[PDB]
A paper describes a structure:
The dimeric reaction centre light-harvesting 1 (RC-[name]) core complex of Rhodobacter sphaeroides converts absorbed light energy to a charge separation, and then it reduces a quinone electron and proton acceptor to a quinol. The structure shows that each monomer consists of a central RC partly enclosed by a 14-subunit [name] ring held in an open state by [name] and protein-Y polypeptides, thus enabling quinones to enter and leave the complex. The angle between the two monomers imposes a bent configuration on the dimer complex, which exerts a major influence on the curvature of the membrane vesicles, known as chromatophores, where the light-driven photosynthetic reactions take place.
Here, we report the structure of the dimeric RC-[name] complex, determined by cryogenic electron microscopy (cryo-EM), at a resolution of 2.9 Å. The dimeric RC-[name] complex was purified from a LH2-deficient strain of Rba. sphaeroides harbouring a crtD mutation, in which methoxy-neurosporene is the major carotenoid. Superposition of the monomeric RC-[name] structure onto one half of the dimer (not shown) indicates an almost exact correspondence (RMSD of 0.177 Å) between the structures. Here, we focus on those interactions that determine dimerisation. The detailed structure of the dimer interface shows that the BChls of the two [name] rings are brought together so precisely that they form a continuous, excitonically coupled chain of pigments, allowing ultrafast migration of energy between the two halves of the complex.
Author numbering:
A (entry chain AA), B (entry chain aa): 1 to 46
C (entry chain AB), D (entry chain AC): 1 to 55
E (entry chain X), F (entry chain x): 15 to 69
G (entry chain H): 1 to 246
H (entry chain ub), I (entry chain UB), J (entry chain UA): 1 to 31
K (entry chain M): 1 to 307
L (entry chain BA), M (entry chain BB): 7 to 49
N (entry chain BC): 8 to 49
The structure:
Amino acid sequence: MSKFYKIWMIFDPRRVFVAQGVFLFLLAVMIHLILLSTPSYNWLEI
Amino acid sequence: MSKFYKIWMIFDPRRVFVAQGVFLFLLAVMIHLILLSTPSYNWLEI
Amino acid sequence: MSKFYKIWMIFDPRRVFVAQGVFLFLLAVMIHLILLSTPSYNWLEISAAKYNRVA
Amino acid sequence: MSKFYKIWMIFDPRRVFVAQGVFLFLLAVMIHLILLSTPSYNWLEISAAKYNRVA
Amino acid sequence: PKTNLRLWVAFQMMKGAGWAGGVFFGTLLLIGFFRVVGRMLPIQENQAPAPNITG
Amino acid sequence: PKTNLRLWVAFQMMKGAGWAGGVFFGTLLLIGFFRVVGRMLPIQENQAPAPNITG
Amino acid sequence: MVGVTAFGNFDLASLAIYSFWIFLAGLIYYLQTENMREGYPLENEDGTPAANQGPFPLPKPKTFILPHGRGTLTVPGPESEDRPIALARTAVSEGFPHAPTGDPMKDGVGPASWVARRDLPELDGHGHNKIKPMKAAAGFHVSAGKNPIGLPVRGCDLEIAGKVVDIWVDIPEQMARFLEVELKDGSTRLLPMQMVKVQSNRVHVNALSSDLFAGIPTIKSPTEVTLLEEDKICGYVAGGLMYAAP
Amino acid sequence: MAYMFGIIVFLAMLAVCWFGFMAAERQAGRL
Amino acid sequence: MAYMFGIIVFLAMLAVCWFGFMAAERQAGRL
Amino acid sequence: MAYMFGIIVFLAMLAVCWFGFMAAERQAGRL
Amino acid sequence: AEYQNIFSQVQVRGPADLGMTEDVNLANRSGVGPFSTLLGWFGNAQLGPIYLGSLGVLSLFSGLMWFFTIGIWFWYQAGWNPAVFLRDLFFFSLEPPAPEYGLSFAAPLKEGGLWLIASFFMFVAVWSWWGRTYLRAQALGMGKHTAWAFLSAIWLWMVLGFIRPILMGSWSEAVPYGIFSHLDWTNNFSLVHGNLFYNPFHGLSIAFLYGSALLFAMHGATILAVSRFGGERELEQIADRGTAAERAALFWRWTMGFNATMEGIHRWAIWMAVLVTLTGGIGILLSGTVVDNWYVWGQNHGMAPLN
Amino acid sequence: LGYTGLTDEQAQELHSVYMSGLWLFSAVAIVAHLAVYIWRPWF
Amino acid sequence: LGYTGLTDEQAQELHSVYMSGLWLFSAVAIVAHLAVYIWRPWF
Amino acid sequence: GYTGLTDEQAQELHSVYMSGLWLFSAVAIVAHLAVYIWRPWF
Amino acid sequence: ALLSFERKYRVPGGTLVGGNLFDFWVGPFYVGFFGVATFFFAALGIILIAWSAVLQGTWNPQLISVYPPALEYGLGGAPLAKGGLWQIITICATGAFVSWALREVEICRKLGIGYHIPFAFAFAILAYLTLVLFRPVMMGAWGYAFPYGIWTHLDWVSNTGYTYGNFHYNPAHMIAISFFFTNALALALHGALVLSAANPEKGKEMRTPDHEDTFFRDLVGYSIGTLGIHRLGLLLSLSAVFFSALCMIITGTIWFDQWVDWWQWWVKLPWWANIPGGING
Ligand SMILES: CCCCCCCCCCCCCC(=O)OC[C@H](COP(=O)(O)OCC(O)COP(=O)(O)OC[C@@H](COC(=O)CCCCCCCCCCCCC)OC(=O)CCCCCCCCCCCCC)OC(=O)CCCCCCCCCCCCC
Ligand code: BCL
Ligand SMILES: CC[C@H]1c2cc3[nH]c4c(c3C)C(=O)[C@H](C(=O)OC)c4c3nc(cc4[nH]c(cc(n2)[C@@H]1C)c(C(C)=O)c4C)[C@@H](C)[C@@H]3CCC(=O)OC/C=C(\C)CCC[C@H](C)CCC[C@H](C)CCCC(C)C
Ligand SMILES: CC[C@H]1c2cc3[nH]c4c(c3C)C(=O)[C@H](C(=O)OC)c4c3nc(cc4[nH]c(cc(n2)[C@@H]1C)c(C(C)=O)c4C)[C@@H](C)[C@@H]3CCC(=O)OC/C=C(\C)CCC[C@H](C)CCC[C@H](C)CCCC(C)C
Ligand SMILES: CCCCCCCCCCCCCCCC(=O)OC[C@H](CO[C@H]1O[C@H](CS(=O)(=O)O)[C@@H](O)[C@H](O)[C@H]1O)OC(=O)CCCCCCCCCCCCCCC
Ligand SMILES: COC(C)(C)CCC/C(C)=C/C=C/C(C)=C/C=C/C(C)=C/C=C/C=C(C)/C=C/C=C(\C)CC/C=C(\C)CCC=C(C)C
Ligand SMILES: COC(C)(C)CCC/C(C)=C/C=C/C(C)=C/C=C/C(C)=C/C=C/C=C(C)/C=C/C=C(\C)CC/C=C(\C)CCC=C(C)C
Ligand SMILES: COC(C)(C)CCC/C(C)=C/C=C/C(C)=C/C=C/C(C)=C/C=C/C=C(C)/C=C/C=C(\C)CC/C=C(\C)CCC=C(C)C
Ligand SMILES: COC(C)(C)CCC/C(C)=C/C=C/C(C)=C/C=C/C(C)=C/C=C/C=C(C)/C=C/C=C(\C)CC/C=C(\C)CCC=C(C)C
Ligand SMILES: COC(C)(C)CCC/C(C)=C/C=C/C(C)=C/C=C/C(C)=C/C=C/C=C(C)/C=C/C=C(\C)CC/C=C(\C)CCC=C(C)C
Ligand SMILES: COC(C)(C)CCC/C(C)=C/C=C/C(C)=C/C=C/C(C)=C/C=C/C=C(C)/C=C/C=C(\C)CC/C=C(\C)CCC=C(C)C
Ligand SMILES: COC(C)(C)CCC/C(C)=C/C=C/C(C)=C/C=C/C(C)=C/C=C\C=C(C)\C=C\C=C(/C)CC/C=C(\C)CCC=C(C)C
Ligand SMILES: [Fe+3]
């Protein structure tokens, strides 16, 4: 750490958190879809 | 609705919302388990 | 090497960190997809063959 | 050869450094992809054979 | 109080993820509509030959 | 502001559902530990007869 | 000629396709340099000539000869802003926005921008004022559609700003080009016809709150509008979409 | 057909949610 | 056996999260 | 034998990251 | 929702507008036609006046005779029956001479003579319309861009009906006059020449045909988007650049990194459209004369896989 | 620098709020990964 | 010379924190490469 | 000059640029030498 | 670097997402939130195409071809080498095209212009999604989509068309073609007419829009006008793409046979079906 908190003096936290919510949701969807595309992990094929 | 808001003068909303969070989570888990117990909906049996 | 800090006198950090952020995510995603494209290194299929799942 | 520093009188370093960054990345990606296309040099397929990792 | 700051960061992220979820599931329901109409039509009887040589 | 009241109700419910989630998944991991130890032991070889007449 | 090659696989259809790639590269160079007759040379944000002017050179000057004695235009040419711009940098680096230093609607910057066009009317082919109030062109009348004259004009705040008192028509094109609105002090303004919705009982101006109608730049003659005045009016109204606050 | 009637039932349910949600923003818009 | 080594790896990861979470409550306990 | 030597190389790489990180922290105190 | 300027809200009608004189021989210009309130919602309401004169009469009479010659053949193929004429209207076809007749004018009237007669009236009608398109611009002192643009379409049409039949050595190569039959001809042409998709000039011609829909969508949407600034008055924006032209230029510069001008976008427009039929005409002229199987030509030129 | 107009103390405070949630979110993720690895391991 | 407006000491400040992140991120990555090489070496 | 760099600003900036060039190529030479040891291409 | 008039327009705001976090330019290009999204998907989709070229084993750019999953995979996932790369590149294409439209909406807001351009572009996106998504989902297999390859996607057009005989007989395909040809006619005329006024005979003054109206009235007895022609060029382009999408969404979902056989409904109308003579009698 030491000074990693200084990122909030470069980038406006309000905007970053909204943009990070979009990223993390799409990353989660991406990984679920990678697994759903794989036969040994397609839980929706019952 | 009319006067249903008066329930917050009977029961302390702070306590009700915490108790309602517990209820809704356990209800959700219950229904997922009912489905997981049923062969045509057991998505975890891959 | 002791003057490489002067890069921040050439380029504004607000643009550089955005560019780097996209770059590092893009590079990582392509390497994972390249390995998943490869039968020797597709970990999800290595585990399926290991555990006698659908392969 | 000592006056090569006058390149920066002609070309703005902000343009050069961005252009250079793009160019060197795409060249490196080009060469790594060419080798992955080359069976004698595809390190993933070489190690697959070395360790009998399929069939 | 620090808790109001905890909840404000959560709220900003749920704004982002909520919109991204609205587009994802809204797309999935549009795909669902075309799948439902595909089920209503006589397509499995009259199923067309594959147009690509990969099959 | 009304938004601070929206987030306070969400926070109270997430307190409840978070604790209820912690006991559910904590139980599921305790069950997981006994399943992992069951896999390590020679039980499938020496599998016991059913103790109930329903089988 | 079928199958006849000069060398390799190079038949007469190869000669054609390679000749076309040379023609296309020449044509694209011609097209892009023609499109550099406005807005070049490129500038730094301070206004000095940018060290990077891009790969294409400026074309040789052409001269347009303007009708009705209005002189000649040479392009490319000396191309100053010819007006003050009330903007200040928000960063020392290039590529960031410049924030309005005062009231951007009235300073005329951003989407409220306007250009120092010629302070004369646009003319028709005969040399009459192209755009006129309809009362000043006796044959004209509203031949179909809801006649707006006499309707109240509502802002996006949903309050009445004024009433429509005339239509300003493009004479050669025979189309409605502005609505004249009489405000609550009896001074009028022109509204661009494309910025208003002529509803059944009202004209709705979604760009302006009812107070902002007094700020609309006024025309100096009540019987004609200059190209400079048009740009100021049209710019100001469109600027409201960004800058009209609730 | 009479299956897709159910798809419409869910859309009727989702219209009730819209009417309820906007009403909840009305019946105390401090109003 | 050498599978359950992985179960321990996840517990090591979860101890790092605890150490990080408490540190985050320390390095600005207004402190 | 590139297994063993591989382990060593990765452990050598990490020692350079330790040097560089401590060097950065040795700069970052307004040195 | 706001106003999009796609249909007009209010129509105004002045007097009839007779238009510019310049060097137009005004005796040859008709009276003004009626106004259409329907057209006024989308564009101008005024019909007419129209200029006739010498190349006008020549073109309109030859074009009438072309149309009438086909129509009578269709009435004959219908057996004069007015019901069959409407049933089979899209199935009638005036076919060119059979291959055994080559280029000779000796084919019987029912075996291709009427197709030559019809094609002669088409030839005169189209070429006299070209000269009319040149001279109407000359009388107004305008540039000849419209006549030179029309020459690019004539090039493809001449290749289809005249030049390639001559170079192939029979009128049987030409297009039949008929709704479905010119479609059957178009399909059969591609099959005989081994899939026309692998003709590179058919590929180019499609690129410019898609590009013309791309570019007119971009340009039409751009001008409507800036029409609130009077950007549809493009000649005054060329003479005296307003905020409309600058906002249009900066939209595309900020979007795709480069932009046109108000004059220069119409050069992109004319060339994108002209190149459709220029490259098209070349691609047909090469078909059968130089390449008889485009798919195999594609295999030898690195665009299809080898067998 | 100081492009956002936060003070240094405001930034130190907010970063701890953010970091506390980061370790919580990743701790929940580890529990979900540990559950999945017990049920259906991928190594 | 400065195109960004950062003073020299500000640039040294920003760089030293930037390099801390680079070495940290690259350390985490080496441990991932080490684990993967232990599991399935590519040489 | 077009950039407006003074001669000393250009000569300063070149010296640091040369340092990155020699560093980057030095790493690349180790990478080539390793792969030539591992699998010669000549 | 700026156009000489550009500076007065580079104000803050108009962004739909991200506020000022991405409200900056990179050379001429505006970035914004969706510019970041656009570049990521564009770069990923391009790079996965180059990687598919490695798996395919060609470097000739005209032979590179990324095929969709075979019909045996249905609408499920396929292996990356065998259709799964196509699926990810289709996601990236959709992400890039949609982000590009949304980035255009932000630029419209900052310049205060109408939204006609991103709205028109959304028609092209829907035609793309018809061919890769909606129609394959209706027909039940990703393999009915076209392959990403310069010439191999023309094989898909050919093979899809000839599945239904001559595809010229699709009646919506005929209407789409009529708009496509008419649009190209109107673009030739509009370009030429504006240029002929701005570039008259040598020594003459610039012509007015009155001369433009006059030339076309003299030529054809009508003139749509300066505003009408830009409405027409937009609607002709959009109609062409609407009827193109329509012609395909019906093909293989409600119509299965040779399209030429459709036109018999007119021939066999009972008031004239049996009348002797003609072509069909
Ligand atoms: C299948 C058929 C297809 C067919 C494809 C379609 C073909 C038919 C359409 C033809 C359109 C012609 C386009 C044109 O006129 O270009 C000149 C014009 C002039 O702009 P300018 O403003 O007056 O001058 C340039 C400069 O002053 C702009 O400002 P600045 O210097 O501050 O920033 C630079 C720009 C982009 O500039 C460049 O990338 C370098 C110049 C490119 C010239 C291209 C033509 C000549 C060289 C071609 C061979 C160059 C070989 C190296 O902004 C940035 O750099 C910011 C970073 C974002 C861009 C990253 C790009 C990464 C590298 C990707 C590879 C790019 C290759 C050009 O604009 C530009 O220079 C930038 C254009 C960027 C988009 C071009 C898209 C069209 C296709 C590629 C170019 C045409 C050749 C096919
Ligand atoms: C099975 C069918 C074949 C095929 C066979 C052909 C053939 C054969 C030809 C084309 C040609 C064309 N094809 Mg192909 N084509 C196929 C598949 C396609 C596909 C697709 C998605 O699959 C597309 C988009 C196209 C697209 C096109 C165009 C780019 C091109 C025509 C340009 C033009 O403007 O013509 C329309 C314009 C004209 C014909 C010019 C007309 C000008 C004259 C002067 C007008 C006179 C008017 C008259 C007097 C009437 C007046 C009435 C007034 C009211 C007064 N083809 C397949 C592979 N295609 C042509 C070409 O150029 O090929 C290279 C061509 O000859
Ligand atoms: C560059 C490529 C594009 C192109 C360009 C183009 N075409 C052009 C032009 C240009 C630039 C013109 O200037 C020219 C024009 O005038 O346009 C308005 C033209 C034109 N493009 C035309 C058509 C056309 N263009 C096409 C395509 C293309 N045109 C390409 C897409 C197509 C097709 C199939 O794609 C067609 C059908 C025409 C509208 C026009 C050429 C007109 C012409 O030559 O007409 C000859 C025929 C006649 C003059 C008359 C025919 C018969 C009528 C029924 C009149 C009868 C009158 C008589 C007195 C009646 C008496 C009745 C009695 C019983 C009383
Ligand atoms: C709807 C009417 C017409 C239309 C309109 C239209 N297109 C538009 C616009 C408009 C109004 C824009 O604003 C926009 C633009 O910016 O234009 C410059 C655009 C545009 N129309 C384009 C192309 C295009 N339009 C076409 C068609 C049409 N566009 C219609 C006919 C066609 C074809 C084949 O008909 C093409 C190729 C672009 C120039 C541009 C959109 C640029 C864009 O999306 O940029 C972001 C994405 C990238 C830079 C690259 C993405 C890379 C992918 C992730 C990987 C590649 C995947 C792809 C599926 C591979 C295909 C291989 C082929 C061989 C099959
Ligand atoms: C809190 C949230 C809780 C969520 C709970 C879980 C919900 C899960 C269900 C979601 C419901 C909707 C799913 C869609 C409809 C459906 O049932 O489909 C089920 C079918 C399976 O059909 C199969 O069956 C089909 C027959 S049938 O439909 O069953 O009759 C058959 O035709 C097909 O071949 C076969 O594969 O699959 C699909 O339709 C595929 C979905 C594809 C989505 C990803 C696309 C990636 C590929 C490239 C395209 C990219 C496009 C990018 C666009 C941005
Ligand atoms: C503490 O500070 C931080 C570390 C948080 C920030 C530091 C400073 C900073 C500003 C960093 C910036 C980094 C950047 C700019 C990173 C950018 C990353 C990108 C562009 C990631 C993109 C990811 C995309 C994904 C995962 C896409 C998924 C799409 C899927 C799964 C398809 C299904 C989804 C949908 C249908 C919804 C979306 C719509 C379409 C059309 C796809
Ligand atoms: C055993 O086998 C079988 C299951 C098959 C057979 C079972 C047979 C059997 C014994 C069934 C018995 C069923 C019974 C006894 C059902 C009774 C149901 C009742 C009594 C339901 C009542 C519901 C009441 C409701 C939902 C009331 C809601 C009230 C509201 C929302 C208002 C709450 C209060 C306020 C807002 C405050 C008001 C004002 C002030 C000033 C505080
Ligand atoms: C609109 O109305 C208001 C929200 C304002 C409330 C109105 C006023 C009011 C006070 C209503 C009160 C209602 C009451 C008291 C309802 C009580 C309902 C109960 C007791 C529901 C219980 C549900 C239990 C469930 C769904 C259990 C699920 C268990 C599962 C799925 C197994 C997994 C669970 C665990 C590992 C934890 C289980 C618990 C323990 C202790 C081990
Ligand atoms: C086609 O077939 C194959 C691909 C198989 C083979 C052939 C490919 C081929 C033709 C390759 C050609 C390769 C070439 C031309 C490579 C050229 C490489 C170069 C010139 C690399 C240069 C690298 C330079 C670097 C990394 C410099 C970095 C500089 C740094 C880090 C410092 C920057 C300066 C400052 C921060 C100082 C700022 C100063 C002030 C006062 C503020
Ligand atoms: C192709 O690749 C595959 C798809 C195969 C794999 C993907 C490969 C790849 C490149 C993955 C990259 C992943 C990355 C870089 C992930 C990064 C994730 C990060 C940085 C996550 C950080 C999350 C931080 C959070 C959630 C912080 C939240 C802070 C908050 C909310 C404030 C504090 C508040 C609380 C603790 C209480 C919250 C409130 C309530 C009511 C519970
Ligand atoms: C198929 O092709 C292959 C994939 C095989 C090609 C492989 C070849 C190839 C081209 C690879 C390329 C790899 C490259 C170029 C990798 C480079 C990676 C870099 C540059 C990584 C850098 C990471 C840096 C980090 C994580 C920095 C973090 C900084 C932080 C956390 C601090 C942020 C700033 C502040 C807190 C503010 C500081 C102070 C003040 C006063 C504002
Ligand atoms: C209501 O009944 C009435 C009789 C009153 C009217 C009926 C009207 C009617 C039903 C008309 C039907 C018209 C149709 C369906 C026309 C279709 C035309 C089509 C689709 C034409 C397509 C292509 C034509 C081309 C490419 C023609 C090119 C011709 C050229 C280049 C001319 C070449 C010239 C010659 C070969 C002639 C050479 C002769 C001499 C003497 C040198
Ligand atoms: Fe135009």
